Amino acid sequence: PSLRKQRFMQFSSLEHEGEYYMTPRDFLFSVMFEQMERKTSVKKLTKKDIEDTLSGIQTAGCGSTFFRDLGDKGLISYTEYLFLLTILTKPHSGFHVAFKMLDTDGNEMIEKREFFKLQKIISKQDDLMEINTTLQMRFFGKRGQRKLHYKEFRRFMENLQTEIQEMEFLQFSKGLSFMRKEDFAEWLLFFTNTENKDIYWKNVREKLSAGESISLDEFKSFCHFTTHLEDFAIAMQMFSLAHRPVRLAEFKRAVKVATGQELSNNILDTVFKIFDLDGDECLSHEEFLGVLKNRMHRGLWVPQHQSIQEYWKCVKKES
Amino acid sequence: PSLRKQRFMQFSSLEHEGEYYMTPRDFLFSVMFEQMERKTSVKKLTKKDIEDTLSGIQTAGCGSTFFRDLGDKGLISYTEYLFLLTILTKPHSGFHVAFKMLDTDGNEMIEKREFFKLQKIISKQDDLMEINTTLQMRFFGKRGQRKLHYKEFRRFMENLQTEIQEMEFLQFSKGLSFMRKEDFAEWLLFFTNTENKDIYWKNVREKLSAGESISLDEFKSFCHFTTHLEDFAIAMQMFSLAHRPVRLAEFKRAVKVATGQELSNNILDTVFKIFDLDGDECLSHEEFLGVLKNRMHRGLWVPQHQSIQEYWKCVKKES
Numbered sequence: 001p002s003l004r005k006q007r008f009m010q011f012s013s014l015e016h017e018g019e020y021y022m023t024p025r026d027f028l029f030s031v032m033f034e035q036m037e038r039k040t041s042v043k044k045l046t047k048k049d050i051e052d053t054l055s056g057i058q059t060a061g062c063g064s065t066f067f068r069d070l071g072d073k074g075l076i077s078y079t080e081y082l083f084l085l086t087i088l089t090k091p092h093s094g095f096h097v098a099f100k101m102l103d104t105d106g107n108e109m110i111e112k113r114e115f116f117k118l119q120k121i122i123s124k125q126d127d128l129m130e131i132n133t134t135l136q137m138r139f140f141g142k143r144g145q146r147k148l149h150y151k152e153f154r155r156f157m158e159n160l161q162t163e164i165q166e167m168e169f170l171q172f173s174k175g176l177s178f179m180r181k182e183d184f185a186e187w188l189l190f191f192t193n194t195e196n197k198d199i200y201w202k203n204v205r206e207k208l209s210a211g212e213s214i215s216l217d218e219f220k221s222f223c224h225f226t227t228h229l230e231d232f233a234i235a236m237q238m239f240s241l242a243h244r245p246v247r248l249a250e251f252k253r254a255v256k257v258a259t260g261q262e263l264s265n266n267i268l269d270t271v272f273k274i275f276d277l278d279g280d281e282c283l284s285h286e287e288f289l290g291v292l293k294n295r296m297h298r299g300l301w302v303p304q305h306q307s308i309q310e311y312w313k314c315v316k317k318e319s
Numbered sequence: 320p321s322l323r324k325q326r327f328m329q330f331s332s333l334e335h336e337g338e339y340y341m342t343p344r345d346f347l348f349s350v351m352f353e354q355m356e357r358k359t360s361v362k363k364l365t366k367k368d369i370e371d372t373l374s375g376i377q378t379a380g381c382g383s384t385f386f387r388d389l390g391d392k393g394l395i396s397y398t399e400y401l402f403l404l405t406i407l408t409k410p411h412s413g414f415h416v417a418f419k420m421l422d423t424d425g426n427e428m429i430e431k432r433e434f435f436k437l438q439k440i441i442s443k444q445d446d447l448m449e450i451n452t453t454l455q456m457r458f459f460g461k462r463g464q465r466k467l468h469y470k471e472f473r474r475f476m477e478n479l480q481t482e483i484q485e486m487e488f489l490q491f492s493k494g495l496s497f498m499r500k501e502d503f504a505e506w507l508l509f510f511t512n513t514e515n516k517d518i519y520w521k522n523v524r525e526k527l528s529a530g531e532s533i534s535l536d537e538f539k540s541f542c543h544f545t546t547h548l549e550d551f552a553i554a555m556q557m558f559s560l561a562h563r564p565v566r567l568a569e570f571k572r573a574v575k576v577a578t579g580q581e582l583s584n585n586i587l588d589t590v591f592k593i594f595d596l597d598g599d600e601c602l603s604h605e606e607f608l609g610v611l612k613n614r615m616h617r618g619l620w621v622p623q624h625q626s627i628q629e630y631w632k633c634v635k636k637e638s
Binding site: 013023025028029032039040041042043068069071072167170171174175176177178180182185186201204205208209210211213 | 332342344347348351358359360361362387388390391486489490493494495496497499501504505520523524527528529530532
């Protein structure tokens with residue numbers, strides 16, 4: 001039982017024939033919540049239970065909203081859990097590559113034999129120490145003979161990413177349609193790898209206005225920039241040479257040209273009010289890039305008991 | 320500075336000419352959150368600031384959703400704060416009485432002179448030790464000569480109550496449209512005046528199913544029953560005589576006939592699975608009524624430093 005499978009069975013809610021399963025509600029909780037306290041216990045299933053659960057996809061919307069629409073009447077195994085988890089953090093321009101990877105070109109579309117190959121990879125990795133899920137029923141028909149083209153794949157992945165962004169936005173905005181700049185500030189500061197947020201809190205107390213809002217499209221654009229941060233930094237490494245701090249206009253032009261996600265002046269103003277440690281109007285790549293380095297936020301826990309190893313590496317490398 | 324005014328200035332966000340004000344976002348936070356940590360500081364205003372804030376009502380929806388629609392561009396003083404706070408917990412059949420109370424019958428509608436009378440009551444209570452808010456602009460026109468009929472008053476109060484129910488539902492359901500029975504259980508157990516929830520948690524662990532959902536209309540109906548609980552208990556006192564525990568069917572019929580809010584079998588089943596301490600299928604009024612006694616939940620803090628007085632009354636009356 002690896003760490004990922006341990007997390008999966010911890011956040012699971014259904015078991016059947018000695019095999020833990022999961023509903024979309026539990027997947028969303030695992031994505032957005034680090035730890036959940038389950039008041040109740042797991043429950044077994046039968047074929048009647050399976051049909052009562054799978055009776056939701058027939059009346060579910062295949063649009064942008066798919067998981068909250070399904071609610072609790074869904075089924076997700078470990079393999080689909082890992083697949084969706086990789087989809088969460090997959091940047092653009094890798095969609096077509098991932099699609100072509102999921103099929104040996106004997107089928108230009110994807111039949112369920114390729115997902116069976118994925119499950120076989122999982123089982124081969126497991127052992128070397130039947131049951132229809134909701135995701136298969138979405139991609140392939142109830143009969144099981146359905147081709148999955150690339151356009152539908154791209155649509156599904158975009159919908160999943162946007163659904164997660166909407167979920168995080170509504171979780172941090174308490175329900176309102178205009179979150180305060182402070183919520184965006186704390187959302188950014190959450191996953192930054194620093195030990196003293198005091199300077200950033202002083203900055204947002206002093207420099208940032210008392211009242212200002214952020215829309216939803218702006219938050220989604222910033223999230224897409226965050227997920228393309230690696231390509232953005234590769235493009236910015238040429239500018240980091242000679243140690244030239246970048247202003248706001250060049251920052252906006254560069255993010256637009258390297259990630260295709262044009263940002264507003266509000267978000268850029270805010271991120272420069274929180275991150276400009278120095279007194280100049282703009283600061284170098286150092287703080288923003290090196291500090292915003294993990295991107296492993298939003299669940300995605302990597303608990304390789306890195307506490308003591310982190311303390312040891314701190315004691316060693318601190319010089 | 321009374322406790323209510325202290326809470327108001329703590330949750331306020333705007334000050335002008337030495338007078339704290341408040342935006343709908345802060346009112347909603349004061350309603351749903353017991354304590355809020357303000358990262359930023361208060362800011363002053365000018366007439367230009369006043370117009371920039373009041374420029375929202377012109378493009379705001381007067382339907383069921385009004386406060387989240389306004390977002391942050393709104394204005395609420397202390398008097399309107401207290402008025403809305405009384406509206407939150409006002410039961411039905413008191414709407415028309417409250418309307419007739421807010422006007423000396425020289426006007427069958429309500430002109431702004433009666434709200435001026437309300438503000439005068441507040442100021443007379445304060446001193447005996449000009450500025451247009453958003454609510455006045457909603458009831459009365461920008462010019463200030465507008466009659467407010469009773470039907471619009473009832474519509475506004477119903478919309479406010481339903482808006483608060485939607486807010487609490489979305490805050491406890493994490494965004495999904497079907498909250499788990501456990502969330503309803505913990506929402507009920509929050510304001511119950513008991514010291515050991517262990518028995519109720521054992522009940523929900525054992526008796527309640529592992530997975531079951533609750534819609535939105537059912538939650539709203541249960542909230543309306545909770546706000547008519549006093550009339551419900553007056554009607555049930557005759558049945559409490561002879562100490563006869565009430566079953567489920569009679570409970571449903573009685574709540575329907577005394578509060579007009581018919582409940583589903585799911586909510587009643589759940590509340591009997593959490594509250595039936597004994598082994599019988601139904602338990603008497605004792606636990607449900609006496610335990611669910613406060614109804615002062617959802618903010619509405621009454622902090623008359625009742626900690627030490629509560630401990631003293633416990634030491635005294637415990638026999």
